[PDB]
Amino acid sequence: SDQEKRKQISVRGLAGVENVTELKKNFNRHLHFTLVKDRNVATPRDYYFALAHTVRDHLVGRWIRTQQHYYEKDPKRIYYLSLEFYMGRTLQNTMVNLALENACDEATYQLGLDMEELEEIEEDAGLGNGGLGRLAACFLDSMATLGLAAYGYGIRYEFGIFNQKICGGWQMEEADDWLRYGNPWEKARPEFTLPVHFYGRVEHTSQGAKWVDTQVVLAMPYDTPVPGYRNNVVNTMRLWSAKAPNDGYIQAVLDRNLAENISRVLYPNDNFFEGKELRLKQEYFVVAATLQDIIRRFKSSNFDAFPDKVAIQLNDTHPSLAIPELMRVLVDLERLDWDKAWEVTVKTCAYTNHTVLPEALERWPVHLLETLLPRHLQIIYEINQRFLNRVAAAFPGDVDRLRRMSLVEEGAVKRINMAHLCIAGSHAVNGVARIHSEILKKTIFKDFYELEPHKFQNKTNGITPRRWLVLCNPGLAEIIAERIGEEYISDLDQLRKLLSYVDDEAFIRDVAKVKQENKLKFAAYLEREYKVHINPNSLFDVQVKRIHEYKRQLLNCLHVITLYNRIKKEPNKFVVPRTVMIGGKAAPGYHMAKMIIKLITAIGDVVNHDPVVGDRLRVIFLENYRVSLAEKVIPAADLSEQISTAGTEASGTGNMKFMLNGALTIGTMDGANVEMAEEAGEENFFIFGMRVEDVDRLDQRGYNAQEYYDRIPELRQIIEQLSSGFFSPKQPDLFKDIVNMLMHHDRFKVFADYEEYVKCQERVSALYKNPREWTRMVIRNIATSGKFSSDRTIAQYAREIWGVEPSRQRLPAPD
Amino acid sequence: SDQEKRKQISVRGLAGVENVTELKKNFNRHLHFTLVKDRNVATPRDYYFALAHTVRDHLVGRWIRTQQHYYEKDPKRIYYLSLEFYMGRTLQNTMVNLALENACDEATYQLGLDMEELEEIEEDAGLGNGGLGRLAACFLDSMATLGLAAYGYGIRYEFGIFNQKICGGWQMEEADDWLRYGNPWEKARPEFTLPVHFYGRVEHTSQGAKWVDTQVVLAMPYDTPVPGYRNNVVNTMRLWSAKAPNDGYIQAVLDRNLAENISRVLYPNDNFFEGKELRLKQEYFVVAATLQDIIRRFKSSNFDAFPDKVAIQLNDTHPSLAIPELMRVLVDLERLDWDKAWEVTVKTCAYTNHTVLPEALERWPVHLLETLLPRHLQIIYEINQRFLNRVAAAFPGDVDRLRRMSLVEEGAVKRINMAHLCIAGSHAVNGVARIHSEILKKTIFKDFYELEPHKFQNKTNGITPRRWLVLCNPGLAEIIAERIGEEYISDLDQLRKLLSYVDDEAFIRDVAKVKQENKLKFAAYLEREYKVHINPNSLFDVQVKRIHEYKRQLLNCLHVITLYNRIKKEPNKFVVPRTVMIGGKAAPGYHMAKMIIKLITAIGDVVNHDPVVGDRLRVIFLENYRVSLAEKVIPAADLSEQISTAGTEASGTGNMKFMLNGALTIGTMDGANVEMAEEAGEENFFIFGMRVEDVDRLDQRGYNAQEYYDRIPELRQIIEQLSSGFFSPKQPDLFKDIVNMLMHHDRFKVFADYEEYVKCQERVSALYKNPREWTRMVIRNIATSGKFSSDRTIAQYAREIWGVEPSRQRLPAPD
Numbered sequence A, B: 001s002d003q004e005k006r007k008q009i010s011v012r013g014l015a016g017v018e019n020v021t022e023l024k025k026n027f028n029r030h031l032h033f034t035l036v037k038d039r040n041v042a043t044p045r046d047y048y049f050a051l052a053h054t055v056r057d058h059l060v061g062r063w064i065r066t067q068q069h070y071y072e073k074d075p076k077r078i079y080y081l082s083l084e085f086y087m088g089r090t091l092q093n094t095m096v097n098l099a100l101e102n103a104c105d106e107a108t109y110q111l112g113l114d115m116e117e118l119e120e121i122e123e124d125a126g127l128g129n130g131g132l133g134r135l136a137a138c139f140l141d142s143m144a145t146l147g148l149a150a151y152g153y154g155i156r157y158e159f160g161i162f163n164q165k166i167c168g169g170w171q172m173e174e175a176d177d178w179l180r181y182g183n184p185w186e187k188a189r190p191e192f193t194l195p196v197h198f199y200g201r202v203e204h205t206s207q208g209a210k211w212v213d214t215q216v217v218l219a220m221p222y223d224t225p226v227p228g229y230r231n232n233v234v235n236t237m238r239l240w241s242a243k244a245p246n247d248g249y250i251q252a253v254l255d256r257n258l259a260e261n262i263s264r265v266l267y268p269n270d271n272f273f274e275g276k277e278l279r280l281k282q283e284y285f286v287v288a289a290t291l292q293d294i295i296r297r298f299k300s301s302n303f304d305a306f307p308d309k310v311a312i313q314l315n316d317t318h319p320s321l322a323i324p325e326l327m328r329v330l331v332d333l334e335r336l337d338w339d340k341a342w343e344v345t346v347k348t349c350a351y352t353n354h355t356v357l358p359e360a361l362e363r364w365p366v367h368l369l370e371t372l373l374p375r376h377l378q379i380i381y382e383i384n385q386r387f388l389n390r391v392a393a394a395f396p397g398d399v400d401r402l403r404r405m406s407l408v409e410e411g412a413v414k415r416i417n418m419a420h421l422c423i424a425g426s427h428a429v430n431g432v433a434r435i436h437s438e439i440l441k442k443t444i445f446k447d448f449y450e451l452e453p454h455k456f457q458n459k460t461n462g463i464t465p466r467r468w469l470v471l472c473n474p475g476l477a478e479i480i481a482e483r484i485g486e487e488y489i490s491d492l493d494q495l496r497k498l499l500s501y502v503d504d505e506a507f508i509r510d511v512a513k514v515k516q517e518n519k520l521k522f523a524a525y526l527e528r529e530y531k532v533h534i535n536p537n538s539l540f541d542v543q544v545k546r547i548h549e550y551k552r553q554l555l556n557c558l559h560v561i562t563l564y565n566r567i568k569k570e571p572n573k574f575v576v577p578r579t580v581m582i583g584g585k586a587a588p589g590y591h592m593a594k595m596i597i598k599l600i601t602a603i604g605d606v607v608n609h610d611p612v613v614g615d616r617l618r619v620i621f622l623e624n625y626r627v628s629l630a631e632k633v634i635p636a637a638d639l640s641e642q643i644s645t646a647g648t649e650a651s652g653t654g655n656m657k658f659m660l661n662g663a664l665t666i667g668t669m670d671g672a673n674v675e676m677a678e679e680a681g682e683e684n685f686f687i688f689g690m691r692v693e694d695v696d697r698l699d700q701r702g703y704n705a706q707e708y709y710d711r712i713p714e715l716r717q718i719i720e721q722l723s724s725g726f727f728s729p730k731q732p733d734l735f736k737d738i739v740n741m742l743m744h745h746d747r748f749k750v751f752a753d754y755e756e757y758v759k760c761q762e763r764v765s766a767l768y769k770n771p772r773e774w775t776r777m778v779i780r781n782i783a784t785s786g787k788f789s790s791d792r793t794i795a796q797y798a799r800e801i802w803g804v805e806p807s808r809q810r811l812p813a814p815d
Ligand SMILES: O=C(N[C@@H](Cc1ccc(F)cc1)C(=O)N1CCC(O)CC1)c1cc2cc(Cl)ccc2[nH]1
Pocket: A056, A057, A059, A060, A061, A063, A184, A185, A186, A187, A188, A223, A224, A225, B033, B034, B035, B036, B049, B181, B182, B183, B184, B185
């Protein structure tokens, strides 16, 4: 067989040029050949798929080319391990990064179809809970845009974050069957399935330890392409799916599902640790399969050069088993000596911390680890012993420090502190905001910082400007481009140039206009899909994020109730109208969080139907908050609420989204809020409340909520209203749990920041009364948000942690 | 929006002409765009998929057109309900019916690929157990070829018939993960999902009965196209998949699998009834979803015309719940009166019986029916009461007949006789071979025949000549075409013309040559994938079918052991060399059937390694017998074994496959064997053993195997060898169960036909010694097999049962 004949098999002239004529042809081809529909039975969903497939074709030509390029060039490869990847919709984002948006628009118009209507049909890819998952998605976009040889590795959950329904004011969870109609963006690779072992036992042979009598679960990869911004670079996100091996009969076949349950559903916990066996299996699963893939890719073009060609970033402690698993492979399978293996491991792994809340920290009981992963538990003990020996050498006689630094936590239930394991086996450990990274060195990891100061870094979070500006706010992106060009899209610092238009009356008018249109649009979307009338001329007060006590949605609730009581007291007095919007999902077993949602809706029940309040105050709970809803509500927001208790929000990222889209911020000196105020100037920020140091003082002396209740009349009245059943007539004591918590067991001191919060809210209302000055402060914000682009964050990881150089060099097009 | 613009959305000029240039282009497009592979990483499996997708495109253009045609013309529609559809591979069959085989061959050659190698990569679609399932597949092909508006409705099992492995001579079952790499021939239709109810209870309202508090399981359809032979007609096979509805949290999501288990696996029972709940659910599932689809299609272009536009064929009693379900819908939902509903039902349904073995008959316990389908059990009782009233009117005072005809079978465990239910609610009941249909009227359904003689018919089975001749035996099809043309392919009766070449020396040489090549090929396939050396010059004695006592593979075993003992007795005597091949799967819990397989391999262990036997005798057990293996071994067979006990094989179809491909038959006067001998002339058939009437005599007086053991020395010796451990040295009494069964509990009288069988086998050996006369008898067989084409069978169903006229009119091509 002449092998020169197989040279015809090329992607050289396939998709055709990116003009309207070829696009319509392919749209048609896909509608008929791919979907087996005709113009008579086709529905809008079918038309949406035909378009997705048409765009996908252009995406694939570049995908194949990018991977060929990396094979030829062999760059250092970056592996981002995360159990979450909150991707959202992919159609629009693909059209924009490939510059096909226009042609697709024209091509769909000539066919008698409306592209915007089609885009709304796409299901959100919700394989994440919130901030942690979305950050991974932003980073993927940025790494592609910066031309890095990066791969995202995670789990392909069959069911992502649940869909939230509100019944009688309460949250109801519904499985998110996001694959029901299929996913055109993923490419299954059954041919690359790998084995993952569980349970079993350890045997010691003359030449080493052997992990035997193990149960096997296969890991099947699904690849999703991730396009960079107009540089023709398409990277890969590989998600693993669990499959049972082929080795009563009927029962035996039905029991296969048991093994496939590993990748069935995403744990809906945000910043909270649940030590369930299934979760541990998910963690080892993603890790074991990923590392095998990494080693084989490494051997296909000894291990001394491993750290030079491989960088493994651990997103939180979820994939922390990668450290002992890498040791297991190198020592048990590759037979390297312990010390060389360890050196390679530390040089390859880096760890990112995302929270300081103690209940969010993973501490796995050893009895669970010894039955499920016996060999890893042995390796962990060894790692521990050698690490503790170093400690003892650096701090002789300090037996207390040894106890505190141990990877093994004593107590009735022995547990492994995964955070300690990550610090010990990583060459770098980073926080996600300046204040958070400092807190890590000053508090929780102080002992580790003293032993190895060089390991601790900071990498302030960011968001991608493509999805969080160009995509969700085309109007804003339009008027900004009409003055400074399109170069900011991949270089956000250029937004700085906008400071020269702070005084231009044309610009001021435009910014205010884009926002009004965004608000008009959002108000329409609300009446259409959730029938209710909000006044588009009111101030849009928005707080959207996962429901959590530390995020203090309750502090927000206290404010709106204060506003209501005020109006009722002096009904004929003028107040700046407000539409307070709060949305977010609560973890299913988080009782307090679910009670907070009920409180929010109970408040709206009273406020929204009080005739004397009128159109002056509306409280709305946005149900099913997700990436696609964030893209709608954020560009329409005037005020962004970032009011977590100082020292609790590691960074936050939603705050940055609001800053980039023309909303002013009211928040505490927490996480990235500190750096945002720093960039825009504290005078262009609505800061309030305790600083981290004040919180420490209060803690030292003791928090007594009663003091505030006794000293603040307005607060007393609110609490009295809550306990009396004012907001729950048929059930007088429905909120007894919330009240009791605020009064006697509030770890986040809501009452302590109440007074400052309200006063601050008053200044917000004062400034909104003056349109031109409000819009001018907004411009001072948008103009200095450049530092919060994920491209900046990634550039820093690359250079300071991974040892690779970014690049905006575009690759050639398929043809 | 101008709706005239949407006229551009057409299949009018898509696939391009069927020439080599366009095919290569599409092959390439699919390899890259569809599979995301390039010529560097692509494997033969990838190349196979690129080709399948290329061929699929041509198949889809016609599919859309055919369905448009039926919409416009609105023919009477035929619905074939079956729980099995043994389809086998689809690539080659599609290329042949579309006449693309050649272009595909040339196009793949110019790309440096070999098409035959690619075809072998396709997985068999094994959604059937054997004869019953394969008949449904043959019928689908025939109905399409005869231009009937027919739809096959079944279940999309995730795992079909298990893969058979032989370990130490024993059968081992391995799940058949046939969807692992995907199925390019199916088109999922999530948009057409329908609800199916289970359990619940019946409430009586003033206006009727209501089935309430039911558990719901969704039914998602997957469509597979079925192309007719070169007539551009593409029909549909719709298979249902079970999906849970979207309404601890983690556990709740994991428990969804419970509902999806309904379509997880095919029960591997052939001609045997297992009353398990899961199986009953599968039966109602396919029925409830199918009938809903049928009603909606009916209303989209009152019920008095239902029987004029709808025909529902029940393949065995598996889908028998269609009768009470149709009544439930018409009476409970559509609110028709009982009598009108009943008339419509009987006029719409027809039932086909496939076996008389009592243990194969479905008799569901009422306690299972009342808890799972309470409303259907009520309807069944009502049907029963009104049917029994008719009986009482026609045969006054005959209380015994009333007991025998009842749909409800008394006893400790009350049961519903589904066969009786089908006869009562169908306008037609048919057997599958002349002798079988007569047995139905004479024995098991005698009471029903006496009440309604007009209901009973016969429809002798057939096989499709496309797959069973053109596809598997191109050489034979070639030489046949070179003398009489290609018109026989869709008109098998024309094979008759071949009787004029019985004396032509050229033809005789050719037929013998095609067979030798087929044998040479099969011998090569055996050494390559199952390393073992058979002599291609020996007589190929083949018996392939499911292992069953009534099929008497044991009678075959007795013969080969006799042959072995004979050789050993007179080693230097000449015998016609033979390669005895036996293959087939045994149901997992069928102990005796699994013991028979072990016996067969034990026999080969001794015979195949006896140096004095040499190349004169080889016993081979063909593992994992399936549709694709049948296509290989059948064309290479010389002698076809169809030796079931007279009166037990309803028809058989494998017998017809062997007849069409040049093998002579040695069998009993059973099932279709009777009609085959009738067509070829009994002198061209090797018939032997008891006739049905002889079996009855023996039964009347009593079967005593000892008599034969006492009177036949050769038989004694065999039994003595078996009990002594001659064939099982390390385990002397391993076959004690088989021996005991043959001696004291043989329901199929193996010993009674032993003597006649051996004598007959001797005549087979005598004729093979004379090549020219052997080949001339073969020609007399091939030439009269025309009557056994499924096109003939379907034509008869259409005209005599469905009321529709066949047609070979070709539809226009897509363009
Ligand atoms: O899914 C894709 N192609 C099909 C091509 C296809 C379709 C049916 C089939 F049977 C085999 C292959 C496929 O490989 N899978 C379909 C689902 C199946 O279970 C596994 C394979 C796909 C191509 C592609 C290109 C890009 Cl750029 C992005 C996502 C993509 N997905």
